[PDB]
Structure formats: C-alpha cells, structure tokens
Design a protein around this ligand. Structure first.
Ligand SMILES: Nc1ncnc2c1ncn2[C@@H]1O[C@H](COP(=O)(O)OP(=O)(O)O)[C@@H](O)[C@H]1O
Ligand SMILES: [Mg+2]
Length: 71
DNA sequence: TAGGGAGTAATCCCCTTGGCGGTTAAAACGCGGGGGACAGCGCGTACGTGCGTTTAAGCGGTGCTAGAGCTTGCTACGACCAATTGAGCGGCCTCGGCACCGGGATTCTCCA
C-alpha cells in the first residue's frame, strides 16, 4: 500500500505540525474516485476537494481555495 | 551515431448539435366593411418641334516659362535587437442601474 503510507505522512504533518495542507494529490483519472474513497477511509478528518468535472464545476470548486493561509 | 520527426492509437477535456416536453404566446384563420387602389374623363398648359439668329466652341498656329521629372550627394532616422518594467489583459467580486410589474392618471381616438 503506497497510497496509505503517503496518506499517513499528511496525517503526521497534521498531527505533529498542525499542517492541514493545502495538500495536492495528482493521480491518473481512473484513480481519482478510488483515492478519494481511500483517503476518506484512512483519514476521516481530511476534507477532500474532488477537483474534477466540466469547467463550470471546477470553477465552482475553486471557490474553496484559500490563498490567505499557507498552513 | 544520435536526435528528433513520422506514424498511430489510446486517453480525456471541451462544445456544438440534436431530442423531449410544455406551454404559451404569437402565428394562422375568418369576415365584415371601408377606403384606397384604379380606371375613366376633361382641360389646359406646358413641352417638343420648327425656323431665323448669334454666338462662341473648336481647330490651326505662335510664343513663352513654369514645373514635372530625373540625377546626385549625404545624413538623418527608423529598422533592428538585447535588456528592463509597467501598462493592460484575464480572472474575481458586488452593488446599483434599469427593467419589469401593477395599478391610478392623462391622452387620443371616434362616433354621435
Ligand atoms: N495498513 C493497511 N490496512 C488495511 N488495508 C491496507 C493497508 N495498507 C494497504 N491496504 C489495502 O491495500 C489495497 C491496495 O493498496 P494500494 O495502496 O491501493 O496499492 P497501490 O500501492 O497500488 O496504491 C487497498 O485496498 C488498501 O485498503
Ligand atoms: Mg496507488
């Protein structure tokens, strides 16, 4: 499980350094809904942005990008 | 000898076309009547034809000088490019202009 090891890094950055992102996961498109479920399973506290869709749906999702906070 | 171009097919985002459903507003259909199209008529005046006059346009001829058209010389200036930045484009935001509605007031029509 390379997925769950990597997620446990972000959970360590959260648990140890209070870094709750922003965290970017890039994956192949067939992986997206899978990894979304995987991160939801392994770490329920991470709010996940499922950034895919037609242009208008992504344009709505960009409203969630906070540029003010680096952590 | 190697690099990057040619071939090709899978991958995945963008976007234009087409269908479904309603519903609703605009196109289609009817018909009376009116008034405007249009033919037919009278007159008169205004425009084409003709003749004598004149006027000046057009052709042949002379003389002049301006200025179009060309050659020469040079330097000013705009093409050129490498370095620098700030004006202006693309994305995001919000509030106020304007439209759309409703109902009461003034205008305009048309028949008496
Ligand atoms: N520590 C674990 N506990 C339970 N299941 C795990 C653990 N680590 C991995 N898995 C399971 O392994 C399966 C495949 O793991 P995954 O990380 O998706 O493989 P990959 O390395 O190809 O990403 C997933 O279904 C995941 O749930
Ligand atoms: Mg994986």
């Amino acid at each position: 499980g390379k997925t769950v090891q990597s997620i446990s890094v972000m959970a360590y950055l959260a648990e140890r350094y209070d870094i709750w992102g922003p965290f970017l996961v890039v994956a192949p498109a067939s992986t997206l809904h899978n990894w979304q479920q995987e991160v939801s399973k392994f770490v329920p506290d991470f709010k996940v942005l499922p950034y895919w869709g037609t242009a208008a749906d992504r344009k709505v999702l960009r409203k969630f990008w906070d540029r003010k906070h680096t952590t």
